[PDB]
């Protein structure tokens, strides 16, 4: 079975994190949540005060064989990720070992750009943080999949469904992505993977 490592830090965006986890589980993907930048504490207070319990400290799962590492947004959570040497090294290791990096909202600009992880990759993120992403790399699009570098990015709380569905498509296929999308009562405008 496919698997995903979803990172959480103080100040992570809870709608982004939780919607993604839920969709991945609906897609049959095994999800582990990891606490980042908390010295092992598993209780994470998210950006609007929602309190989540992570499964494990990052340092205990960073070497696992997950197919994708997921970086939720939330400006303070993304800063924690950026400033965690373990988080940054783990993202680089996922990439170098042929796996997927997935990041939403503030995470592309705050984590990926300062560390030059994908120097010529195409990416999106929260629109009013556009200028934190190099102009030659920026696209203003609900989801961007750069297949060359296996980088999936997305824009905000309202694109979390689109983001999760594309992870499902990539790890377990279009039919499963459509099956999950069909469970949700999705808004018009969001791609449902039927075609």
Binding mask 155-184 for Mg ion (x = CB under 5 A): -------------------x----------
Q: How far apart are the C-alpha atoms of 37 and 175, rounded to whole Å?
A: 37
Q: How far is the CB of 108 from Mg ion (least distance, A)?
A: 23
> Which of 26, 100, 29 has the alpha carbon at shortest distance from 67?
100
46 is catalytic: no
Count of residues engaged in binding a second copy, rule: CB under 8 A? 37
CA atoms within 13 A on the CB side of 185: 0
Regarding 52 and contact with Cl ion (CB under 5 A), the answer is no
CA atoms within 13 A on the CB side of 154: 28
Token look-up 């319990």 returns: 53
Q: How far is the CB of 141 from Cl ion (least distance, A)?
A: 4
User: Which of the residues 116 through 135 are near a second copy (CB under 8 A)?
Assistant: 126-127
First CA to last CA distance, the chain = 24
What DSSP designation does 134 have? -
Q: Which is nearer to Mg ion, 141 or 174 (CB)?
A: 174
Q: Which is nearer to a second copy, 45 or 88 (CB)?
A: 45
Among 42, 50, 56, 59, binds Cl ion (CB under 5 A): 59
- Residue 161's binding partner among a second copy, Cl ion, Mg ion, none (Cβ under 5 to 8 angstroms by kind) is a second copy
Q: How far apart are the C-alpha atoms of 141 and 139, rounded to whole Å?
A: 6
Q: Which is nearer to Cl ion, 58 or 177 (CB)?
A: 58
Q: How far is the CB of 177 from Mg ion (least distance, A)?
A: 9
> Which of 19, 12, 58, 16 has the alpha carbon at shortest distance from 35?
58
Q: How far apart are the C-alpha atoms of 6 and 24, rounded to whole Å?
A: 10
Return residues touching a second copy (CB under 8 A): 13-15, 18-19, 21-23, 25-26, 31, 43, 47-53, 126-127, 142, 155-159, 161-162, 183-190
């Amino acid at each position: 079975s496919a698997s995903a490592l979803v990172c959480l830090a103080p100040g992570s965006e809870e709608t982004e994190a939780v919607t993604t986890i839920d969709l991945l589980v609906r897609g049959g993907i095994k999800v582990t949540t990891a606490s980042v930048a908390s010295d092992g504490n598993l209780a994470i207070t998210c950006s609007r005060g929602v309190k989540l319990l992570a499964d494990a400290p990052l340092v205990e799962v960073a070497d696992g064989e997950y197919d994708v590492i997921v970086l939720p947004g939330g400006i303070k959570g993304a800063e924690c990720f950026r400033d965690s040497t373990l988080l940054v090294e783990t993202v680089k290791q996922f990439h170098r070992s042929g796996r997927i990096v997935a990041a939403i909202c503030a995470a592309p600009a705050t984590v990926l750009v300062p560390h030059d992880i994908f120097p010529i990759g195409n990416m999106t993120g929260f629109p009013t943080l556009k200028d934190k992403i190099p102009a030659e790399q920026w696209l203003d699009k609900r989801v961007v999949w750069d297949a060359r570098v296996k980088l999936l990015t997305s824009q905000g709380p309202g694109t979390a469904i689109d983001f999760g569905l594309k992870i499902i498509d990539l790890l377990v296929g279009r039919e499963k992505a459509h099956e999950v999308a069909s469970q949700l009562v999705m808004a018009a405008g969001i791609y449902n993977y039927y075609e």
